[PDB]
């Protein structure tokens, strides 16, 4: 019902190698378009999608300078956060950043976010008012006070309502055949007997976009979400996704179960049933 322009930062160190590694990726809905890895010889901001390929000379020259300097402040920030928690200098720690903006029908900004995480746990996060932060720890208060006195929330509120919305609108228009595409999944139910009285029904859903899909098993109308074994959505490789949902049923009762698929690429939800 909306669209998303999301960026992901990752900086982590290790013993011996000293100098940490910075990786930045950007996604428009479920398709990425930009890359920056500091392990390259001369790291540039490299495109990943065919619609950002054109653009203009400064867009790559400035975002390279933006990402290269972002790689520097986060290798210093890694030691700063470690010192806040007062940890040994020989270990290996990680810092992740996730900021973006969700836009609705006619450019409506529904929600803007900008959160950080240290060693996988939530560290600092911008509130939904986009004017102040929330801190998880007391060591994170050192970052909160530093970002409060610098007024970085007013800066953050200006990006999420301005450049984040326009660039997502620019991406959606230029990659219309790729982003606004709604490919429905090809579905089928396989049947694997597993024991003397049990068989496994696997409800497949292949080659669909976007990623959001619902796979539900039902036994004569009764929902079996607790009894099902759902698998995580996996990328097929060529911009689409795959998914399947398993369920162990008694042998001979396969006709009493139904798989229900819901996806925006299908005008109506599907209800499948196994056929020998």
């Amino acid at each position: 019902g909306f669209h998303s322009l999301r960026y992901f930062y990752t900086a982590w160190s290790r013993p011996g190698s000293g100098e940490p590694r910075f990786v930045a990726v950007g996604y428009v809905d479920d398709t990425q378009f930009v890359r920056f890895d500091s392990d390259n010889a001369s790291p540039r901001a490299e495109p990943r999608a065919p619609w950002v390929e054109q653009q203009d000379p400064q867009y790559w020259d400035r975002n390279t300078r933006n990402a290269r300097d972002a790689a520097q402040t986060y290798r210093v920030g890694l030691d700063n956060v470690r010192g806040y928690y007062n940890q040994s200098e020989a270990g290996s720690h990680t810092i992740q950043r996730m900021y973006g903006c969700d836009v609705g029908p006619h450019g409506r900004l529904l929600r803007g976010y900008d959160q950080l995480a240290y060693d996988g746990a939530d560290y600092i996060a911008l509130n939904e008012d986009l004017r102040s932060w929330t801190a998880a720890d007391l060591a994170a208060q050192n970052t909160r006070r530093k970002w409060e006195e610098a007024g970085y929330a007013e800066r953050d509120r200006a990006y999420l309502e301005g450049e984040c919305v326009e660039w997502l609108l620019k991406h959606l228009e230029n990659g219309r055949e790729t982003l606004l595409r709604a490919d429905p999944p090809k579905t089928h139910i396989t049947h694997h007997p597993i024991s003397d009285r049990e068989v496994t029904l696997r409800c497949w859903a292949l080659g669909f976009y976007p990623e959001e899909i619902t796979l539900t098993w039902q036994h004569d109308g009764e929902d079996q979400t607790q009894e099902m074994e759902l698998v995580e959505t996996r990328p097929d490789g060529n911009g689409a996704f795959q998914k399947w949902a398993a369920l162990v049923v008694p042998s001979g009762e396969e006709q009493r179960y139904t798989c229900h698929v819901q996806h925006e690429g299908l005008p109506q939800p599907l209800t499948l049933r196994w056929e020998p």
Partner: peptide
Amino acid sequence: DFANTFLP
């Protein structure tokens, strides 16, 4: 277009 990178 990346945003302003704030230093923790």
